[PDB]
């Protein structure tokens, strides 16, 4: 529900 880089589909995920 909050992070970065790792999920499919909702909203984040991954980046720097």
Do not use: N
């Amino acid at each position: 529900i909050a992070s970065a880089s790792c999920t499919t589909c909702i909203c984040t995920c991954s980046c720097s």
